[PDB]
Amino acid sequence: APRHGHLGFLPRKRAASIRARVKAFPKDDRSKPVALTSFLGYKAGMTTIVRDLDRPGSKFHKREVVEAVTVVDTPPVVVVGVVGYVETPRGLRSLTTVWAEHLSDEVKRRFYKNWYKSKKKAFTKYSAKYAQDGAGIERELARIKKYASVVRVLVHTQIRKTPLAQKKAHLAEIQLNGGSISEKVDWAREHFEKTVAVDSVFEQNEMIDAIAVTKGHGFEGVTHRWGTKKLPRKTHRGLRKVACIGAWHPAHVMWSVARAGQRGYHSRTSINHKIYRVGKGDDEANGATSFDRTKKTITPMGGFVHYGEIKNDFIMVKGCIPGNRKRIVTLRKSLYTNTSRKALEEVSLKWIDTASKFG
Amino acid sequence: EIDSFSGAKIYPGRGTLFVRGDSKIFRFQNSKSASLFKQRKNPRRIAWTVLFR
Amino acid sequence: QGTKFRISLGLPVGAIMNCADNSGARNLYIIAVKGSGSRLNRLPAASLGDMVMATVKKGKPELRKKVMPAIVVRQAKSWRRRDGVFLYFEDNAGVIANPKGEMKGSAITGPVGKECADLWPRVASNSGVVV
RNA sequence: CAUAUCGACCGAGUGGCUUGCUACCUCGAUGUCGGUUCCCUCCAUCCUGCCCGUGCAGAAGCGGGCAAGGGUGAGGUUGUUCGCCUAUUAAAGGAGGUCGUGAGCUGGGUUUAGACCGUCGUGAGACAGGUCGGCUGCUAUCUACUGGGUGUGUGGUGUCUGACAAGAACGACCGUAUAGUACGAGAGGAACUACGGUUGGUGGCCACUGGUGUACCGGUUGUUCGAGAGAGCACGUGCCGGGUAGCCACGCCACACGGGGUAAGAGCUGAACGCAUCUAAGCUCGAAACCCACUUGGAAAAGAGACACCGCCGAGGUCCCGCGUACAAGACGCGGUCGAUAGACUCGGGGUGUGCGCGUCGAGGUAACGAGACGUUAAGCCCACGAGCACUAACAGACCAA
RNA sequence: UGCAUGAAUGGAUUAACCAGAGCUUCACUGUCCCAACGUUGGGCCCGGUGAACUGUACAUUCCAGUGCGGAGUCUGGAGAC
RNA sequence: CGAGAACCGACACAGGUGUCCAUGGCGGCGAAAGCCAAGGCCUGUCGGGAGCAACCAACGUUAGGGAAUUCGGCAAGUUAGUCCCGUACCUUCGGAAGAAGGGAUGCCUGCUCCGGAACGGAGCAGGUCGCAGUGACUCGGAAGCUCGGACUGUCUAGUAAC
RNA sequence: AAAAUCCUGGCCAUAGUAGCAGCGAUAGUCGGGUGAGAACCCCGACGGCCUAAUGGAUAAGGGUUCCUCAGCACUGCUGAU
């Protein structure tokens, strides 16, 4: 036709959860695992960067601007609880957990510190009931004899310091892909009691998919849903209405064709985001730089967007999608598809643009 | 890389350069001193300008 | 080949721009630009770097009337960069060119962009000013 | 030289896009032509991929095969369909869907009532002639589809699995090196591969450029409040000038390869038929096409899933309160003093363009009076952003739950 | 060279006038490229008030076929809590 | 009562229906706009809630391009008041004409002229603020060619105003 | 009578759906009074609307609609003291 819009994401509902849930995980060999194959914090707006060109066959091996783009604030994040899954037929099902007696002092909301008495609302993950071993044993025994499935960890990003966030942490399980299994099972156990950061699984130059719900409005008409033609002038005054949808035996149309509905919202990954930078907020410089405890490298003066200043661990993900927006939560990944080869541990990052957003 | 109307510094990766008719006109810090320039206004005259005072 | 510089398309078809000299040029108006695609509510598009087909609206000589082509030298719409962030500057722009790609007018009024030279030399050449 | 190519006569078919026929269907009514918008399809393929032939040196072609992944426009006259014309283009293919599409639009034409002209008629009036004007009803019951919920069938929190489903998520072109090379007397003039870019499509984003911005600031006409100051109205900004945030495109970013199996075709080994043979068994390659890869959806897949932890007298959840990264209702997400969630205040960051008052100057005028200039004054006024800051308000408390 | 003009069935022509028919130019502009944001009233939820159209029956349909040759209801399949 | 409920229209109907108040203030040419008195009213009579989505009705602003839209510039926009300068073809000498086009415009201080005077009008000099001085409001876009009917006027109450 | 777009009456679905928004007149809000009951009955304050008319006086036409007291089954686009 071509058909307007594209089937793919479907149906195109709203999005359950405003947290992305990656459908697939990288498959790996020569791996730890990460546990946090995916690890993420979320968006502040972004400027642009001047970057040295990397290593192309091409002549350009000099300064060039790329949208140093949407710097997202991450991390650190903690994985409390590696969860086993074991046995089919049916599908994956949880086994038993692990634990952690660290309990970030804010993980009450959406977690612990639930009323002891049962509440009509279901209780979230809270635990004082502990059996570190037993869980370990259960998993090990259901390893040799039965099975196990890929193991993952709970994770929860803390809002140690982000503009307008709270003890609430909305985290979801990220899988660990190590070697055999039992080797990896050990790995997720070590990185259990303990905490992590981006500088773990990550690397500048390395490509990662990014996922998050798009920001967007509620139901709208056909035109700015999948694009549809407006007009012609008659019912021009009225809202854009597509020609009748399907006509024949079924009275109703399944259609797959232009219908009003929710838009905005989403849940979609992007593929092969390069991660030009890794970063921080603490001052570190090859040579003398500003002093008096300056701030993060890339946050615009005037703050950025509604939620300003960054002063801690960052990530720059060029050509910002980001697959969502301002102060939401993207999830990082590893680049499952991959195309071009990885670049380097770092990029030159000759200049970063810092300017008030307005102006 | 310094602004040549308002003054100070220009962020590493932002700030435009536009070109006027014949080559002329320099950078900007951003759209701020920009429109200010568009309206005939001299930076050495208004408010905080590095050039100012 | 590669512009190496991102460009947003400032002017669509039916747009009127200024030749930065041909002979008897004037203001050409845009007709489809190079091999390009379309979509619903397409609005063809054009931008610095893209060869365009055009007609001479103003004129003097019997250049006016039409046929073309010309390449858009400058545009009012942003750009991109490699270093900084970039500009838009002047008014839009365009110079008639032969299938060879050479200008069909000795002098080019106005400046020209840097990575327009890369795409077509000779155009950048009789620049008068670059950047 | 039938068979590179063109190809009559005659003969056999396929399609259901044109036309005709049926006078079979409808006259207690299936809304016209053309256009538009929006979806699907056909071949019998125009381009692109891979191939065969050539009257194939090369280059450019011509013809044929596989193949439907993707692509295949903008304008001037005319109501036109059609068609003529122009400049672009890889190319600007054709056809079906009640000549798709009026409970979607338009109403220019046909074909009401008014009127003119020509022709015909004694005349009323006529014309398969021309012309000007000449209306577009309905609150969706069912069904269909797009999205959203409540239930039933097969304790909760968080993280996943993937049966299947969607995609063109990419298509194409120009240029440079190759190379003024191979090939060629010369004229002329390639390729593999590696690069740069453009165009069309797709997704997202706003630092940059641009638009808006009846937030805001200023200038100014008329009039009313006695003047001044400060204001109302002039459609819902009087007009003009500037413009923050946000939203946007004319702005910016990202969108492979590769692998597997094939078609046409090129071959291998190889018989039937001791030879020959790409085929009969077997096999190596080989298309933009097919599968995978990649993006999106997806436990209601009834084989209705998996894992970890918490929990069954309390895990969690709903209501509530303060707000949004969300939003037509519903939903979603965050925070709730173990607090920076919102407001106030201050500062930072921004927009206008220097305030009232007073002092000096000011064409002049006895004087009264005096448009305006300068100073005080980077003033004054203002902000949908940020930070600091518990001052104020997130209280109080309810309910459900194995 | 008028298919088939023509003189008060008036011919030709014409300043001024015109919500009359056609065309061109400058100016203008969201008519368009190509759509975006905002404003007010609705729309959505809640209290109250409260009709009409229409109705042989049955009715979750879809692809095809068949039939008075334009079927949700016949036939075969497919799909369907 | 004399009417967005006392009249006619089946109704407490956005329709229709005569006369006098035309000398209330500012404004300005004004019985104009806008604002405000006197006088009248909150009865053009259902409310409550969600930043309040899609879609719809009215409408504002949109960069660059500028009629490419369309049967057709339909719709919207542009111009605009007043004074000075200046004003083409054609013509029935009336007109065409506000042709076109160009300039000016506020406030403040002090004045001159016309008049008996106005809280009437026309100017002068100097000072001075803004992006913009008919600052809102009120307020023409302009030019040319052709066809028809000379003109003002009449007409299908209810799809035709020619 | 099963039938006549049959006549008359009654009744279901439609629907707790449409309308009670659109008009150059967008109009109320906070206290208080009365009352069995008050968003719209009355008082005050604050905020607005109308200016050849939503003001004043009248013709026709209506015909008691005027005033007072008592009321709310009817009428009033919701409620009503």
XYZ file of N, CA and C (backbone and C1' of nucleotides) in Angstrom, chain D residues 50-124:
525
model
P 23.440 -10.050 -7.960
O 23.030 -11.539 -8.338
C 23.011 -12.560 -7.342
C 22.342 -13.791 -7.881
C 22.769 -14.232 -9.270
O 23.998 -14.940 -9.273
C 20.412 -14.311 -9.105
P 24.826 -15.067 -10.645
O 23.977 -16.135 -11.455
C 23.986 -16.154 -12.880
C 22.795 -16.922 -13.378
C 22.695 -17.028 -14.885
O 23.493 -18.110 -15.333
C 20.605 -16.355 -14.004
P 24.484 -17.903 -16.579
O 23.597 -18.296 -17.832
C 22.980 -19.583 -17.915
C 21.956 -19.589 -19.018
C 22.427 -18.994 -20.333
O 23.166 -19.909 -21.120
C 20.309 -18.113 -19.788
P 24.270 -19.352 -22.149
O 23.430 -18.645 -23.301
C 22.524 -19.398 -24.111
C 21.800 -18.489 -25.070
C 22.657 -17.590 -25.946
O 23.165 -18.280 -27.081
C 20.806 -16.367 -25.091
P 24.546 -17.796 -27.759
O 24.195 -16.371 -28.373
C 23.206 -16.250 -29.413
C 22.885 -14.795 -29.676
C 24.061 -13.899 -30.021
O 24.345 -13.976 -31.417
C 22.641 -12.818 -28.442
P 25.775 -13.493 -31.978
O 25.394 -12.558 -33.211
C 26.071 -11.310 -33.451
C 25.071 -10.267 -33.872
C 24.008 -10.012 -32.819
O 24.408 -8.850 -32.106
C 22.985 -10.611 -34.878
P 24.020 -8.672 -30.566
O 24.813 -9.833 -29.823
C 26.247 -9.875 -29.847
C 26.783 -9.753 -28.446
C 28.295 -9.780 -28.312
O 28.828 -8.482 -28.541
C 27.312 -11.199 -26.687
P 29.907 -8.257 -29.713
O 31.309 -8.261 -28.954
C 31.996 -9.492 -28.650
C 33.254 -9.196 -27.872
C 33.032 -8.273 -26.685
O 32.650 -8.989 -25.522
C 34.825 -7.454 -27.987
P 31.569 -8.348 -24.530
O 32.270 -7.009 -24.036
C 33.504 -7.059 -23.314
C 34.008 -5.665 -23.068
C 32.973 -4.711 -22.500
O 32.867 -4.823 -21.085
C 34.082 -3.686 -24.319
P 31.449 -4.542 -20.377
O 31.096 -3.061 -20.827
C 31.737 -1.935 -20.225
C 31.164 -0.664 -20.789
C 29.648 -0.621 -20.805
O 29.095 -0.225 -19.560
C 30.461 0.016 -22.928
P 27.601 -0.692 -19.182
O 26.720 -0.158 -20.398
C 26.526 1.249 -20.604
C 25.663 1.489 -21.819
C 24.338 0.744 -21.842
O 23.301 1.383 -21.101
C 25.431 0.441 -23.913
P 21.976 0.544 -20.719
O 21.389 0.192 -22.154
C 20.615 -0.977 -22.370
C 20.573 -1.282 -23.839
C 19.541 -2.322 -24.224
O 18.292 -1.674 -24.421
C 21.625 -2.870 -25.211
P 16.953 -2.339 -23.838
O 16.671 -3.521 -24.864
C 16.581 -3.253 -26.269
C 16.628 -4.537 -27.047
C 15.814 -5.674 -26.459
O 14.433 -5.560 -26.762
C 17.959 -6.472 -27.033
P 13.352 -5.920 -25.627
O 13.397 -7.508 -25.585
C 13.083 -8.270 -26.748
C 13.455 -9.721 -26.546
C 13.000 -10.413 -25.272
O 11.639 -10.799 -25.266
C 15.236 -11.019 -25.735
P 10.893 -11.019 -23.855
O 11.574 -12.339 -23.262
C 11.349 -13.615 -23.881
C 12.147 -14.700 -23.194
C 11.932 -14.913 -21.702
O 10.781 -15.686 -21.400
C 14.246 -14.948 -22.171
P 10.122 -15.592 -19.933
O 11.126 -16.387 -18.995
C 11.396 -17.774 -19.205
C 12.280 -18.296 -18.102
C 11.832 -17.980 -16.686
O 10.841 -18.867 -16.209
C 14.150 -17.573 -16.882
P 9.805 -18.360 -15.102
O 10.657 -18.333 -13.760
C 11.201 -19.551 -13.226
C 12.042 -19.272 -12.013
C 11.381 -18.467 -10.912
O 10.563 -19.268 -10.074
C 13.551 -17.621 -11.316
P 9.155 -18.693 -9.568
O 9.545 -17.414 -8.711
C 10.439 -17.518 -7.599
C 10.924 -16.153 -7.199
C 9.839 -15.128 -6.934
O 9.284 -15.260 -5.627
C 11.519 -14.163 -8.291
P 7.743 -14.877 -5.382
O 7.754 -13.291 -5.434
C 8.636 -12.533 -4.600
C 7.955 -11.266 -4.153
C 6.649 -11.465 -3.391
O 6.560 -10.439 -2.397
C 6.245 -10.228 -5.374
P 6.075 -10.790 -0.905
O 7.164 -10.136 0.056
C 8.545 -10.496 -0.029
C 9.401 -9.480 0.692
C 9.113 -8.024 0.340
O 8.204 -7.418 1.262
C 11.362 -8.500 -0.159
P 7.289 -6.178 0.790
O 8.321 -5.023 0.458
C 9.078 -4.396 1.496
C 10.052 -3.419 0.900
C 9.436 -2.401 -0.044
O 8.870 -1.291 0.616
C 11.315 -3.372 -1.082
P 7.683 -0.483 -0.094
O 8.371 0.227 -1.343
C 9.456 1.146 -1.150
C 10.090 1.508 -2.468
C 9.207 2.169 -3.510
O 9.097 3.567 -3.289
C 10.496 0.465 -4.527
P 7.718 4.322 -3.604
O 7.543 4.208 -5.175
C 8.347 4.986 -6.060
C 8.122 4.553 -7.481
C 6.695 4.592 -7.990
O 6.316 5.883 -8.414
C 7.706 2.555 -8.626
P 3.293 7.364 -9.002
O 3.367 8.642 -8.070
C 3.788 8.530 -6.708
C 4.753 9.632 -6.380
C 4.326 11.025 -6.799
O 3.384 11.654 -5.951
C 6.553 10.680 -7.470
P 2.413 12.759 -6.575
O 3.395 13.937 -6.982
C 4.155 14.629 -5.984
C 4.690 15.915 -6.547
C 3.655 16.803 -7.211
O 2.988 17.619 -6.258
C 5.548 16.586 -8.620
P 1.648 18.393 -6.675
O 2.155 19.366 -7.815
C 1.301 19.797 -8.869
C 2.103 20.580 -9.870
C 1.309 21.136 -11.031
O 0.738 22.392 -10.685
C 3.214 20.008 -11.853
P -0.654 22.824 -11.328
O -0.282 23.157 -12.835
C 0.319 24.413 -13.185
C 0.189 24.652 -14.666
C -1.190 24.365 -15.233
O -2.112 25.423 -15.042
C 0.428 23.325 -16.588
P -3.655 25.073 -14.797
O -4.166 24.638 -16.234
C -4.180 25.583 -17.311
C -4.841 24.990 -18.533
C -6.179 24.298 -18.340
O -7.249 25.231 -18.320
C -4.793 23.012 -19.773
P -8.412 25.092 -17.218
O -9.253 23.835 -17.699
C -9.942 23.827 -18.961
C -10.429 22.430 -19.271
C -11.212 21.750 -18.160
O -12.577 22.114 -18.225
C -9.580 20.263 -19.025
P -13.315 22.682 -16.922
O -13.421 21.405 -15.975
C -13.317 21.525 -14.548
C -13.684 20.220 -13.875
C -12.885 18.990 -14.276
O -11.657 18.913 -13.554
C -15.204 18.479 -14.266
P -10.262 19.166 -14.313
O -9.834 17.735 -14.853
C -10.419 17.203 -16.034
C -11.450 16.173 -15.677
C -11.049 14.725 -15.889
O -10.399 14.202 -14.736
C -13.150 15.150 -16.894
P -9.053 13.347 -14.896
O -9.554 11.901 -15.325
C -9.929 10.926 -14.342
C -10.526 9.711 -15.008
C -9.664 9.046 -16.064
O -8.731 8.151 -15.495
C -11.869 9.274 -16.878
P -7.214 8.178 -16.001
O -7.335 8.233 -17.594
C -7.815 7.098 -18.328
C -8.007 7.440 -19.787
C -6.798 7.987 -20.528
O -5.919 6.968 -20.983
C -8.699 9.296 -21.046
P -4.336 7.256 -21.029
O -4.210 8.544 -21.954
C -4.672 8.522 -23.308
C -4.762 9.925 -23.854
C -3.484 10.749 -23.836
O -2.664 10.469 -24.961
C -5.268 12.048 -22.991
P -1.108 10.880 -24.944
O -1.118 12.470 -25.014
C -1.575 13.145 -26.190
C -1.405 14.638 -26.044
C -0.047 15.115 -25.561
O 0.909 15.197 -26.593
C -1.738 16.257 -24.379
P 2.458 14.996 -26.239
O 2.798 16.208 -25.269
C 2.752 17.548 -25.764
C 2.957 18.550 -24.655
C 4.199 18.439 -23.788
O 5.367 18.959 -24.397
C 2.326 18.907 -22.429
P 6.808 18.441 -23.911
O 6.993 19.108 -22.483
C 7.008 20.531 -22.340
C 7.433 20.910 -20.948
C 8.625 20.159 -20.378
O 9.868 20.648 -20.848
C 6.924 20.312 -18.744
P 11.139 19.666 -20.890
O 11.628 19.627 -19.383
C 12.019 20.830 -18.725
C 12.055 20.619 -17.242
C 12.897 19.452 -16.777
O 14.274 19.786 -16.720
C 10.824 19.435 -15.641
P 15.356 18.624 -16.509
O 15.067 18.150 -15.026
C 15.329 16.825 -14.613
C 14.751 16.615 -13.248
C 14.972 15.233 -12.683
O 16.249 15.130 -12.098
C 12.702 15.793 -12.461
P 17.142 13.844 -12.406
O 16.192 12.635 -12.008
C 15.653 12.536 -10.686
C 14.839 11.279 -10.554
C 15.539 10.015 -11.012
O 16.360 9.476 -9.987
C 13.344 10.085 -11.907
P 17.705 8.687 -10.376
O 17.199 7.433 -11.210
C 18.115 6.584 -11.916
C 17.470 5.245 -12.192
C 16.070 5.321 -12.779
O 16.140 5.395 -14.192
C 16.106 3.811 -10.948
P 15.318 6.528 -14.972
O 13.833 5.965 -14.995
C 13.523 4.763 -15.708
C 12.246 4.168 -15.184
C 11.068 5.122 -15.099
O 10.404 5.200 -16.347
C 11.245 3.863 -13.093
P 10.467 6.551 -17.205
O 9.751 7.640 -16.294
C 8.325 7.721 -16.215
C 7.831 6.904 -15.049
C 6.387 7.162 -14.653
O 5.809 5.928 -14.244
C 7.848 7.733 -12.855
P 4.239 5.667 -14.461
O 4.165 4.321 -15.301
C 4.552 3.066 -14.736
C 3.997 1.947 -15.574
C 2.511 1.686 -15.414
O 1.716 2.573 -16.180
C 3.681 -0.358 -15.336
P 0.359 3.160 -15.548
O -0.720 2.025 -15.820
C -0.978 1.581 -17.154
C -1.486 0.160 -17.152
C -2.786 -0.142 -16.415
O -3.936 0.136 -17.194
C -1.181 -1.808 -15.930
P -5.306 0.580 -16.472
O -5.787 -0.697 -15.646
C -6.368 -1.810 -16.320
C -6.593 -2.969 -15.377
C -7.544 -2.821 -14.198
O -8.909 -2.935 -14.575
C -5.627 -4.046 -13.543
P -10.064 -2.426 -13.577
O -10.175 -3.556 -12.470
C -10.674 -4.848 -12.810
C -10.732 -5.720 -11.589
C -11.533 -5.195 -10.415
O -12.926 -5.401 -10.579
C -9.477 -6.062 -9.645
P -13.963 -4.388 -9.897
O -13.772 -4.648 -8.344
C -13.998 -5.948 -7.799
C -13.625 -5.986 -6.342
C -14.305 -4.999 -5.412
O -15.578 -5.520 -5.036
C -11.983 -5.162 -4.907
P -16.664 -4.586 -4.311
O -17.188 -3.577 -5.424
C -17.452 -4.010 -6.769
C -18.715 -3.364 -7.311
C -18.945 -1.868 -7.073
O -19.612 -1.370 -8.234
C -20.795 -3.089 -6.308
P -19.316 0.107 -8.789
O -18.744 -0.176 -10.245
C -17.821 -1.257 -10.479
C -16.654 -0.777 -11.299
C -16.001 0.499 -10.810
O -15.037 0.198 -9.830
C -16.357 0.623 -13.147
P -14.752 1.238 -8.658
O -14.382 0.308 -7.429
C -15.198 -0.826 -7.096
C -15.154 -1.082 -5.611
C -15.577 0.096 -4.758
O -16.976 0.114 -4.560
C -13.510 -0.733 -3.979
P -17.760 1.501 -4.633
O -17.225 2.318 -3.381
C -17.545 1.912 -2.036
C -16.670 2.650 -1.054
C -16.810 4.169 -1.043
O -17.742 4.589 -0.052
C -14.517 3.547 -1.179
P -19.267 4.894 -0.443
O -19.363 6.480 -0.489
C -18.921 7.288 0.624
C -19.901 8.415 0.885
C -21.337 7.995 1.151
O -21.509 7.757 2.544
C -21.257 9.831 -0.374
P -22.133 6.372 3.053
O -22.407 6.632 4.599
C -23.069 7.829 5.037
C -23.760 7.604 6.358
C -22.898 7.214 7.547
O -22.303 8.315 8.204
C -24.789 5.821 7.470
P -20.717 8.406 8.254
O -20.380 8.420 6.697
C -19.192 7.848 6.174
C -18.170 8.928 5.960
C -18.405 9.981 4.882
O -19.264 11.048 5.297
C -16.158 9.232 4.846
P -19.958 12.003 4.193
O -18.810 12.992 3.733
C -18.127 13.832 4.669
C -16.974 14.513 3.989
C -17.340 15.324 2.762
O -17.748 16.640 3.111
C -15.524 13.908 2.256
P -18.853 17.387 2.227
O -18.094 17.727 0.878
C -16.865 18.467 0.882
C -16.286 18.498 -0.507
C -17.241 18.983 -1.580
O -17.205 20.394 -1.656
C -16.130 17.015 -2.301
P -18.574 21.213 -1.654
O -19.142 20.971 -3.112
C -18.309 21.178 -4.255
C -18.916 20.526 -5.467
C -20.353 20.917 -5.764
O -20.658 22.086 -6.537
C -20.146 18.563 -5.787
P -20.581 22.055 -8.131
O -19.051 22.343 -8.454
C -18.670 23.377 -9.400
C -17.974 22.769 -10.589
C -18.808 21.806 -11.423
O -19.515 22.497 -12.448
C -16.763 20.778 -10.840
P -20.970 22.006 -12.887
O -20.706 20.745 -13.820
C -19.963 20.855 -15.042
C -19.907 19.512 -15.736
C -21.253 18.876 -16.060
O -21.750 19.297 -17.320
C -19.878 17.307 -14.952
P -23.329 19.441 -17.542
O -23.886 17.955 -17.417
C -23.550 16.966 -18.408
C -24.216 15.637 -18.111
C -25.714 15.622 -17.893
O -26.409 15.642 -19.123
C -24.662 14.225 -16.293
P -27.609 16.674 -19.337
O -28.687 16.179 -18.289
C -29.948 16.837 -18.157
C -30.434 16.698 -16.747
C -29.486 17.242 -15.687
O -30.270 17.754 -14.631
C -29.885 14.957 -15.294
P -30.653 19.305 -14.600
O -32.145 19.284 -14.055
C -33.105 18.366 -14.607
C -34.448 18.528 -13.941
C -34.977 19.943 -13.833
O -35.550 20.407 -15.039
C -35.273 18.841 -11.764
P -35.257 21.905 -15.513
O -36.246 22.777 -14.629
C -37.659 22.519 -14.648
C -38.322 23.176 -13.466
C -38.091 24.672 -13.346
O -39.030 25.408 -14.121
C -37.703 23.623 -11.257
P -38.512 26.404 -15.260
O -37.619 27.458 -14.481
C -38.223 28.510 -13.721
C -37.318 29.708 -13.683
C -36.837 30.213 -15.028
O -37.772 31.053 -15.671
C -34.998 30.033 -13.571
P -37.897 31.010 -17.262
O -36.514 31.599 -17.777
C -36.122 32.946 -17.463
C -34.717 33.223 -17.949
C -34.417 32.941 -19.412
O -34.838 33.974 -20.283
C -32.669 32.081 -18.079
P -35.031 33.658 -21.843
O -33.564 33.760 -22.445
C -32.788 34.955 -22.279
C -31.399 34.758 -22.817
C -31.305 34.247 -24.241
O -31.439 35.272 -25.199
C -29.826 33.030 -22.872
P -32.067 34.925 -26.624
O -30.910 34.125 -27.357
C -29.620 34.714 -27.513
C -28.653 33.722 -28.093
C -29.126 32.912 -29.286
O -29.045 33.633 -30.496
C -27.944 31.522 -27.785
P -30.032 33.268 -31.697
O -29.460 31.894 -32.243
C -28.171 31.835 -32.867
C -27.814 30.408 -33.190
C -28.881 29.626 -33.934
O -28.819 29.861 -35.328
C -28.061 28.330 -32.136
P -30.148 29.767 -36.216
O -30.510 28.222 -36.208
C -29.666 27.263 -36.860
C -30.135 25.862 -36.550
C -31.606 25.589 -36.808
O -31.885 25.313 -38.169
C -31.034 24.787 -34.668
P -33.298 25.760 -38.793
O -34.324 24.765 -38.101
C -34.209 23.353 -38.302
C -35.276 22.634 -37.531
C -36.682 23.190 -37.657
O -37.342 22.769 -38.833
C -36.211 22.723 -35.390
P -38.515 23.672 -39.439
O -39.647 23.621 -38.325
C -40.346 22.405 -38.051
C -41.326 22.605 -36.926
C -42.244 23.811 -37.003
O -43.340 23.623 -37.869
C -41.444 23.550 -34.792
P -43.793 24.820 -38.827
O -44.135 26.003 -37.824
C -44.326 27.336 -38.310
C -45.483 27.997 -37.606
C -45.428 27.991 -36.093
O -44.645 29.070 -35.640
C -47.600 27.405 -36.816
P -43.609 28.848 -34.452
O -44.532 28.466 -33.213
C -45.458 29.427 -32.661
C -46.400 28.764 -31.682
C -45.761 28.040 -30.507
O -45.521 28.973 -29.460
C -47.409 26.658 -31.511
P -44.347 28.711 -28.407
O -44.949 27.642 -27.391
C -45.870 28.028 -26.356
C -46.501 26.806 -25.739
C -45.562 25.838 -25.038
O -45.415 26.173 -23.671
C -47.007 24.652 -26.483
